[PDB]
């Protein structure tokens, strides 16, 4: 992508304002629960003003940063795509569970991811990407060997390096993996997203193995969901104690959220603190808490520690 000037930033500002106006329509009924695009876009705008404020005068180094260019390009694409969603989705935008409506929700999730990534690589408006400290040491060593001190890398290169260390069986597996790790949906992989994924499916030594057993084949996996959606889904098993599902939170990237019904029965949530997910699932199953994945009678034996 081309070097970022203040002009293009102002253009993205205009597009974001347009999307905000399109979402401010009264007939849309905005659910305040995340992702809330009417809060996302302004926060992105304000953080962008912070980055520009700290890099005022020295705009030369800010416009040459590879991640900032990729981010601004992605923001351009996503905002423009949202405008197109409203444009070619006339009446259907004013419904429930509609195609452009669900697409708008998904794009909102993307905006949330991009805002989190932006605040992560630019904390307090100052760049902190070439100064990475990935939570998992093994994953950080892999990134250090493969891409060195680069903040972001193209998806193809990441797939190559990952396949060198962790073999990928099929292109389908690579696609599903891509849909899982590429949160900003820009065909790129940042150190931020890499940290999130490797924290999610720890340990590193059996990364793709955990991902196949926790995400791909485990019927309890629900990807990104809202607490209300978890409640509404587990509601069909409020009479079947032990039934559980786990999700990802757009407000808490890198951590799992296990929802389970009790013997009363109430629906409760548990967030493991730097535990491998399968460890918490095994422990919970042996204690009669996590018995039925998505209500299914058979729970996956994850005793492959």
């Amino acid at each position: 992508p081309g070097t970022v000037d203040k002009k293009m930033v102002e253009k993205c500002w205009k597009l974001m304002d347009k999307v905000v106006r399109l979402c401010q329509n009264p007939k849309l009924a905005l659910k305040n629960s995340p992702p809330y695009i009417l809060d996302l876009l302004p926060d992105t705008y304000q953080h962008l003003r912070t980055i520009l404020s700290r890099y005022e005068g020295k705009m030369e180094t800010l416009g040459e940063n590879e991640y900032f260019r990729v981010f601004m390009e992605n923001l351009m694409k996503k905002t423009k795509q949202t405008i197109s969603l409203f444009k070619e989705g006339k009446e259907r935008m004013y419904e429930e569970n509609s195609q452009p409506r669900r697409n708008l929700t998904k794009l909102s999730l993307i905006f949330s991811h991009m805002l989190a990534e932006l605040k992560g690589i630019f904390p307090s408006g100052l760049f902190q990407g070439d100064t990475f400290r990935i939570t998992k040491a093994d994953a950080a060593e892999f990134w250090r060997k493969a891409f060195g001190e680069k903040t972001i890398v193209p998806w193809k290169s990441f797939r190559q390096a990952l396949h060198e260390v962790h073999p990928i069986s099929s292109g389908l597996e690579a696609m599903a993996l891509k849909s899982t790790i590429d949160l900003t949906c820009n065909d790129y992989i940042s150190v931020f997203e890499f940290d999130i994924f490797t924290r999610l499916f720890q340990p590193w030594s059996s990364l793709l193995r955990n991902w196949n057993s926790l995400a791909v084949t485990h019927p309890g996996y629900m990807a990104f969901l809202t607490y209300d959606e978890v409640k509404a889904r587990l509601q069909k098993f409020i009479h079947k104690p032990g039934s559980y599902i786990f999700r990802l939170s757009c407000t808490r990237l890198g951590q799992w959220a296990i929802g389970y019904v009790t013997a009363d029965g109430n629906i409760l949530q548990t967030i493991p603190h730097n535990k491998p997910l399968f460890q918490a699932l095994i422990d919970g199953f042996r204690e009669g808490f996590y018995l039925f994945p998505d209500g299914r009678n058979q729970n996956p034996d994850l005793t492959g520690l």
């Binding site: 795509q81 697409n103 998904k106 794009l107 696609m175 599903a176 891509k178 849909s179 899982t180 949906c185 065909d187 995400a215 791909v216 084949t217 485990h218 019927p219 309890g220 996996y221 629900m222 990807a223 990104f224 969901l225 999700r247 998505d294």
Partner: peptide
Amino acid sequence: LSEGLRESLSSYISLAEDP
């Protein structure tokens, strides 16, 4: 077997630049 990877894969196919 699949479950919620279906949702993310469907979203990906429907919204990304693809393949």
